[PDB]
Amino acid sequence: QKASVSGPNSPSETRRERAFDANTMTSAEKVLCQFCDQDPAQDAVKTCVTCEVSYCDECLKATHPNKKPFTGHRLIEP
Ligand SMILES: [Zn+2]
Ligand SMILES: [Zn+2]
């Protein structure tokens, strides 16, 4: 002899964290991919000196379609 109801409490105790500071050295940021247009864009982990512009991976994949190891364009000198 007892009662039992379904659908217990569920208080949304979730939180977030947003920020928008200037360009500062923290760990892994670097310049933003100019070709990107995500807004925010994707970090540019590449830089083609010949193109004179810094790009990311994805972009580099479309713009610089290389099948490795590096038979495509050029990058930051050694
Ligand atoms: Zn990009
Ligand atoms: Zn290039």
Swiss-Prot record:
- Please give the tissue specificity annotation from the record for this chain: In the fetus, highest expression found in kidney, followed by brain and lung. Expressed at low levels in fetal liver. In the adult, most abundant in heart, placenta and brain.
Start-end of B box-type zinc fingers: 30-78
Top-level taxon in the UniProt lineage: Eukaryota
Signal peptide region = none
Q: Where does Zn(2+) 2 bind?
A: 48, 51, 64, 73
Subcellular location per UniProt equals: Cytoplasm; Cytoplasm, Cytoskeleton; Cytoplasm, Cytoskeleton, Spindle
Which residues are annotated as modified residue Phosphoserine in the UniProt record? Answer: 6, 10
Q: Where does Zn(2+) 1 bind?
A: 33, 36, 56, 59
* Triggers of expression: A retroviral element acts as an alternative tissue-specific promoter for this gene. The LTR of an HERV-E element enhances the expression in placenta and embryonic kidney.
PTM entry text: Phosphorylated on serine and threonine residues.
Assembly and partners are described as: Homodimer or heterodimer with MID2. Interacts with IGBP1. Interacts with TRIM16.
Family stated for the protein in its record: Belongs to the TRIM/RBCC family.
Its function?
Answer: Has E3 ubiquitin ligase activity towards IGBP1, promoting its monoubiquitination, which results in deprotection of the catalytic subunit of protein phosphatase PP2A, and its subsequent degradation by polyubiquitination.
Q: Which disease is it linked to?
A: Opitz GBBB syndrome: A congenital midline malformation syndrome characterized by hypertelorism, genital-urinary defects such as hypospadias in males and splayed labia in females, cleft lip/palate, laryngotracheoesophageal abnormalities, imperforate anus, developmental delay and congenital heart defects.
- What's the protein name? E3 ubiquitin-protein ligase Midline-1
Q: Which organism is this entry from?
A: Homo sapiens (Human)
Q: What is the lineage of its organism?
A: Eukaryota, Metazoa, Chordata, Craniata, Vertebrata
